[PDB]
């Protein structure tokens, strides 16, 4: 626990705005959320404000809507919670098994006690007849982010799996750098286990609600072939 880290309260709200494009199609999202940052739980309500109804799966967007809301055991310091009031940024690459590619950048700030999220997304090389652009996915399976500290940043990697409507999994590798806007006490390497659910949506996905539970843990031990 660091001095000033109690600016992240037991209950916190956020506002989010995304500007994005998928295979050259521009869109925008606006939303709001809330959660229990020390319990690792949160919800959000998102609305499509431009480019709707989206001609692609919501599951591409859902992991882009909140790093203050991760539970930690007592001996893993919270990189993101310590970054306040200044906050942090992140830079992500998603590489899908069929060659779809997504670059995402994000800014997190704090204004009058509310967390402010600005997201920029560019997706390219999605097969037009693939499960993303045909809207044939059915949410994210629970996954694990392996995080390690380097040069005052955190580097994360996720083996991500989207459920397919017709059965089976559609995989991605998701690599992200997380960058505090000031120096903070760094954790060791550790894992974040996560389950993100779409709890409700209107028929055309112009209004979407999501929930996530995120928990930090140690690894038990890595660079093995099998
Ligand atoms: Na998160
Ligand atoms: Na879901």
Author numbering: 2 to 66, 71 to 226, 228 to 232
What do the paper's sentences say?
The large Stokes shift in RFPs is induced by deprotonation of the chromophore in the excited state supported by a hydrogen bond network formed between tyrosine hydroxyl of the chromophore and side chains of the Glu or Asp amino acids located in the close vicinity. In this study, we employed rational design and random mutagenesis to convert conventional bright RFP mScarlet into LSSRFP, called LSSmScarlet, characterized by excitation/emission maxima at 470/598 nm.
There is one protein chain per asymmetric unit, and a contact analysis revealed that the protein is a monomer in the crystal at pH 6.5, i.e., in a highly fluorescent state. LSSmScarlet has a typical β-barrel fold with the mCherry-like chromophore formed by 67MYG69 amino acids and positioned on the central helix of the barrel. The phenolic hydroxyl group of the chromophore forms two hydrogen bonds with the carboxyl group of D147 and with the buried water molecule. The negative charge of the pair D147/phenolic hydroxyl group of the chromophore is maintained by R198 that is stacked with the phenolic group of the chromophore as well as hydrogen-bonded to D147 via the solvent molecule. Two rings of the chromophore are almost perfectly in the plane in mScarlet, but phenolic ring is out of the plane in LSSmScarlet with corresponding twist and tilt angles of about 5 and 20° (according to Figure 6 in).
